[PDB]
Symmetry: C3
Subunit: 281 residues, 3 copies
């Protein structure tokens, strides 16, 4: 697979729901909200109309990074694009291809790893919403972008991964050789440094080197702060083989307190070498 040229006009329904544990989630269907919210994938040029409904007892909003949107889809109290309790609103996101402007410069596409989150709960910056779990990924693909066997979203939200209690992963499974895509988002108050054992990627738009003349740095550790978003694709177990490969924040008290999960890379027979589930507790 490779992404095709874009330009489809899409629609979807989206709800903001209270979840258990005092949380809040987005979902595509009533009663199916998740944390992180649902992954929205677009190709450059597609438009997405989001038929949005607020099912909670407090205003909420939908603010997106990186995608074209007019002020009316800003998703803020400050230009009256929030959604009252029980209210509804259609947010529109647009994307565009890159190309030469008439002044000679190059307009950058919308392609990239982006995200969306609340901007209204708690404060007019969505501090309460984001803490509760109102966030999710948006991938915009360029025509020709290689496509992954799977996509996993890792959000460092304050001292949590995906709002989970400490040392509860999440874990992610792949088989040696799968092309795995990772979307990494950070939210909240703290900086973090995302690290993956056994695996590395290029610090560019795709996480993959364009070819032999890409000078981007190849890393396995990146500092990130609130609302940063990047992603990459790795071949699971490439050059290293199967195993329970940790990913964690490398800030030493963060990993000690539980900002750790496993990238479980399995042999073809589905087993994991030297993976004693209880030696990782």
């Amino acid at each position: 697979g490779a992404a095709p040229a874009g330009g489809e006009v899409r629609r979807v329904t989206m709800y903001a729901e209270r979840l258990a544990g005092g949380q809040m989630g987005y979902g595509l269907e009533k009663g199916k909200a998740s944390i992180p919210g649902p992954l929205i994938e677009l190709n450059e040029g597609d438009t997405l109309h989001v038929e949005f409904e607020n099912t909670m007892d407090v205003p909420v909003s939908l603010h997106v990074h990186g995608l074209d949107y007019e002020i009316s889809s800003d998703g803020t109290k400050q230009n009256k694009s929030h959604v009252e309790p029980g209210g509804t609103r259609t947010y529109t996101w647009r994307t565009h291809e890159p190309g030469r402007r008439a002044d000679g410069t190059w307009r950058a596409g919308s392609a990239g790893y982006w995200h969306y989150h609340d901007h209204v709960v708690g404060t007019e910056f969505g501090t309460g919403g984001i803490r509760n779990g109102l966030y999710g990924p948006v991938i915009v693909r360029r025509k020709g972008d290689v496509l992954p066997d799977a996509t996993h979203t890792i959000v460092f939200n304050d001292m949590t991964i995906n709002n989970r209690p400490a040392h509860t992963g999440p874990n992610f499974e792949a088989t040696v050789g799968d092309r795995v895509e990772i979307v990494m988002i950070t939210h909240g108050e703290y900086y973090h440094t995302f690290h993956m054992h056994g695996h590395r990627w290029a610090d560019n738009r795709t996480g993959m080197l364009t070819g032999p003349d890409d000078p981007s740095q190849v890393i396995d550790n990146k500092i990130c702060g609130p609302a940063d978003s990047f992603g990459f694709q790795i071949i699971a177990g490439e050059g290293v083989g199967a195993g329970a490969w940790m990913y964690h924040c490398h800030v030493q008290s963060h990993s000690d307190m539980g900002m750790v999960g496993l990238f479980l890379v399995k042999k073809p027979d589905g087993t994991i070498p030297g993976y004693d589930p209880q030696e990782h507790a």
Copy 2:
């Protein structure tokens, strides 16, 4: 609207002065000091002799990032290039173009988004003088760089933008279609994440991709730490139209405590849709 080749020897007078309620700033003429300090632009290859005068009762200095300067223009007490009270000094900053060295490798030029600040007030690293307002931006352009319709300078200085009180901006104005340049400098103790609503830029030298071969990440949110500086040009309203477009620090307590302003992009008739002055 493109930068020319440099090589001109330029001179400017700068002054350090005190300002109201504890603050201090640089000025091009006395009485006229500002926080941030004056924007300095140069073309790669230019030399700049800053004829500097400290009008304050305490020592001060002028230290610059990225530009060429000999150790005597270090702007540090450590190297004895600070400026005593009432004193004067001439700091020389030079720039160069990119080109191939003798050893055959490529030497990077001076072009970039840079800044200058005090290095001796409060501490030997400027801690009290940076806190007080003693910082400013420097742009060095390469030959061929497209020139903006405006440049606006945003300094995250601890928990403030441009040492301004919380929730007071600043706001900048443009018209849809304007090529707008933002200079972003961070100072103090805190990390930040700069975010702009409705607009995006490439994470490279200019903030614009070189072309279809430029693999630089395109972003709208950037982590920055003390003495980081970067800049970019955007077409205002490009693909998103007019309106009051927020920029802020995206650390949640920071934006909550007031690290937020507006990029007011106006329709050619001058009105901003949706905006509530």
Copy 3:
């Protein structure tokens, strides 16, 4: 002087973990010669390194590496039972690969870059104790044709110290104007830092050096960094600025104020640094 050659050799080294004075711990290649930072390990892409490792201490220790290819048995984590018991021995194997075109048409990133190793088991199962105590070291993987330097120096921001040195005690590095000097910068611990050098700059890419006039990497003199970040650059000492006691420091204001400063002592050909008086520093 010159270029990195093509890799492919299988190298062996003995490495030791040893107690050092002051409650510190260090790696070394020979007994009694442990250092903080540990020894610089240098490989070319394709090289294999069998580290014959010995733990001379009374507590468990491990060797974990960033960026290189290792199988999960050389993870160096208690979690995967690749730590070394007090008095114990273990051969860690690190591999590197050249970049190249995969059968799927994408470009495989090579191992080349500025990497580091460190402990993963001392104090906590994320090595928080052994990293505090000085168990960390640089690794450089060179791509064929990489420019070699006249000298390489390693600067590790470890918590609020540089190379575990007392406040304001450097270290200092000396070069002559025109020397090609390689800096390897690693960060560790709990804190974010910004690395700054007076009178010098580099490219934010793999080598630190612009590949040519087509390379768009930002050129910087100041770089935010977090725990386990590792980058490097080569500069021409004093190029366009002359001899001098050029400070490098973390630019987080209170960090420099309280010790995170050192000196790049760049000398004229006659050995002099005019104006340099250590008592003013």
